[PDB]
Design a protein around this nucleic acid. Structure first.
Lengths: 141, 167, 62, 65, 83, 53
RNA sequence: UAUUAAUCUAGAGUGUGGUAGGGAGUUUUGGAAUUUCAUGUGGAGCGGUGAAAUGCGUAGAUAUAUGAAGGAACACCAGUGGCGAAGGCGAAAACUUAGGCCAUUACUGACGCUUAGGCUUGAAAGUGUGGGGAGCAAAUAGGAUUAGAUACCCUAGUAGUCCACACCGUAAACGAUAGAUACUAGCUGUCGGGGCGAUCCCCUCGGUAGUGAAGUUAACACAUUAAGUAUCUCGCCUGG
């Protein structure tokens, strides 16, 4: 697996991932590559586990200290994209945190909310039962 | 460094006094060695300088330090028996990069297209072909290897169609 | 519904069926138009010059 | 096409290239622009500098009127 | 000239490493010393002033990095003159 | 300047060179700002290019 | 996230090879030309403008050819051009020097972006100090014009435009567009570096152009050289 053209770290993984996925959803591509991290791979797994991401392969370079991840887009019949919007609530400058009882809902709570809380990365519905608060990063729908 | 000095001798005096003046003003350099002395004959002036019409150009090539040029320059400028004392240094537009050697073929190849001794020649003075060698890679590849894949899926190719029922 | 002969510069959404092929050349358009004419004439059991005819014929532009 | 780029000069000294330098002068000693010869930009600027020095070195007339 | 041969051969940990902070600060100090004389010779040159300010700011940045990262690394630097 | 021909054929080239010299010399009849002179240079270049192709 | 201990180079830096550039300070020389003067040639106009007049012209104007002195600017070169942070940079050379580009198994090792305050530079005009002052001309005079003209027209014309020291920091100092950044359809040019190699044409990346899809937008229009989905920071605004 060779690309002949490397990819760089932009300013922060969180912003870059959402910008790239939105660019993929708007520019009609099939394969898009990003930087990889444990938080990154966790977010990708929790997105793909419920039909929002697609087949993703993470590659590790020959020096075992570098790794990136390529991921396909969630498409459906008759050429229609599935990602209908991403909004990053969190920011490198502003780190807004909310308690458990005020966990935000995705327009009815029917979308997907990412809660990277002290008990790892968990979605809204599963974390509601735990009665455990956490942080909110991005609404995806 | 490298240096070239082009000098205009005074008037149209004979070659013997010309060489005498050349060496006399050449001994004005502070400590430069490895020099060379050449001559370029007699040429007329397309425009009068002070009152004369002909002169000799003399080209001296040498190399040395950057702090051994003031004396000769000022001595030539003060003396009234010289006309032009132009100086050229390697800062002039140049190229001698060590990878320019394969230009030898070029120096002949164009002459191949300009060669002509008969009037029935039908060769190509301009034919852009650039004979292909298939060696064009000058970028660094970055090889990589995968680790795992979670929930693989195969994507159907693009199809744009509707109207499944008409009859 | 609409079918069309689209060159490699069109938008594959305006026409319900895209058949990309040459249009600047005459005999290619002739061939495709004859195939489509056979496709529209097969309803009335009319014969065909193509469509399971292993041999082709040439008609250059004049 | 111009006989300054394909063959390749890449170095213009004061002399040993007089014919090429005079090839870039009009009867009135004006330096013809790119729109006639067709040589490259860098080559044109190089010969322009060389011709200016030659004017200063009295190889070609400043003006012929 | 800006010739760079002398201070490099004595301010490096080894001949295999030329990117250490030691050679960086030594070369930057040598260049600053050159530009001081260059600018005092050419009083009314402003691009030289800008270059000198940029290089001294770079030296200050390297010094503060070594201050807050490796105290022993610049404390033993006797070739580099403080103030 | 100078121009030479036997008796008659001079006239066409004489007209060309005379008009070119007049158009060149009209630039040193009344002074304008240097920036405006550069803008005029740009405009003349655009006019010539669009008329030359 | 933050403190901190310890590793790696994918960020950025310095090293190596190649490479472009009116970048910049100081210092020498040249060319047309303009003015003045000298020389011989000649006799009533020259100049200006719509027409005229002031003015210039027996003291030989104007012009012509040569020669001497003088100060400023560098014809084409010169461009869908280059270089810079900007201001801006264009006759030739010299020394000093700033930054950038391409390719790299070089090396420290997150040293980076941004920046309230502080510091530096910054067209032109203006002043103080000493020169220079060929034209060119703020104010002012005169002639002409005008209902009236302190203006557009013309003849003088001193500041200043030039230099050396210092201050002033202002302009539509514009891309009416802050900087750093990843990604996001294409096409026609155009300059440099590398490979290829007669350039011409091909490929990789850059800065400089135009066109143009999605999208953006009140519209004009924008579009890989964003005014796009976006992040970080500084500054700024809440009716005249």
């Amino acid at each position: 697996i060779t690309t002949t053209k490397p990819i760089k770290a932009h300013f922060d993984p969180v912003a870059d991932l959402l910008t790239k996925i939105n660019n993929a959803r708007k520019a009609k591509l099939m394969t898009v590559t990003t930087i990889a991290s444990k938080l990154k791979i966790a977010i990708l797994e929790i997105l793909v586990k419920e039909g929002y991401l697609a087949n993703f392969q993470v590659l590790e370079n020959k020096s075992k200290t570098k790794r990136i991840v390529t991921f396909n887009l969630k498409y459906t019949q008759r050429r229609i994209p599935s990602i209908n919007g991403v909004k990053q609530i969190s920011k490198p400058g502003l780190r807004i945190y909310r308690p458990f009882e005020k966990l935000p809902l995705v327009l009815n709570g029917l979308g997907i909310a990412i809660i990277s809380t002290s008990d790892g990365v968990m979605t809204d519905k599963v974390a509601r039962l735990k009665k455990i608060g956490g942080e909110i990063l991005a609404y995806v729908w | 460094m490298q240096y070239n000095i082009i000098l205009l001798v005074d008037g149209s005096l004979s070659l013997e006094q010309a060489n005498q003046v050349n060496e006399k003003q050449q001994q004005t350099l502070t400590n430069v060695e490895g020099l060379q002395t050449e001559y370029l004959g007699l040429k007329e002036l397309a425009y009068p300088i002070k009152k004369q019409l002909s002169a000799h150009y003399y080209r001296w090539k040498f190399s040395g330090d950057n702090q051994s040029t003031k004396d000769f320059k000022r001595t030539a400028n003060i003396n009234k028996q010289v006309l032009r004392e132009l100086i050229i240094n390697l800062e002039r537009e140049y190229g001698y990069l060590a990878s320019i050697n394969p230009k030898k073929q070029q120096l002949a190849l164009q002459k191949r297209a300009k060669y002509d001794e008969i009037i029935a020649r039908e060769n190509n003075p301009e034919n852009p072909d650039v004979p292909v060698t298939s060696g064009l890679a000058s970028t660094q590849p970055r090889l990589s290897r995968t680790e795992k894949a979670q929930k693989p899926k195969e994507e159907l190719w693009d199809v744009v169609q509707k109207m499944g029922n008409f009859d | 519904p609409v079918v069309a002969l689209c060159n490699t510069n069109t938008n594959p959404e305006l026409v319900d069926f895209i058949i990309p092929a040459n249009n600047h050349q005459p005999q290619s358009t002739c061939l495709l138009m004859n195939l489509l004419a056979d496709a529209v004439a097969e309803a009335k059991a009319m014969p065909t010059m193509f469509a399971y005819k292993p041999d082709e014929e040439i008609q250059i532009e004049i | 096409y111009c006989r300054f780029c394909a063959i390749g000069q890449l170095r213009i000294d004061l002399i040993d290239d007089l014919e090429a330098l005079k090839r870039f002068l009009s009867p009135y000693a004006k330096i013809n622009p790119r729109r006639i010869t067709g040589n490259c930009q860098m080559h044109q600027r190089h010969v322009a500098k060389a011709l200016k020095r030659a004017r200063y070195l009295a190889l070609v007339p400043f003006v012929k009127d | 000239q800006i010739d760079k041969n002398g201070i490099i051969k004595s301010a490096q940990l080894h001949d295999k490493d030329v990117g250490s902070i030691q050679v960086q600060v030594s070369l930057l100090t040598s260049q600053i010393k050159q530009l001081t004389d260059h600018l005092l010779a050419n009083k009314k040159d402003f691009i030289s002033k800008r270059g000198l300010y940029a290089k001294v700011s770079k030296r200050k940045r390297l010094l503060k990095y070594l201050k807050h990262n490796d105290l022993e690394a610049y404390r033993n630097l006797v070739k580099t003159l403080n103030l | 300047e100078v121009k030479n021909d036997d008796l008659e054929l001079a006239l066409k080239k004489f007209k060309r060179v005379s008009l070119e010299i007049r158009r060149l010399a009209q630039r040193h009849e009344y002074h304008l700002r240097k920036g405006m002179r550069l803008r005029e240079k740009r405009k003349i270049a655009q006019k010539k290019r669009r008329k030359f192709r």
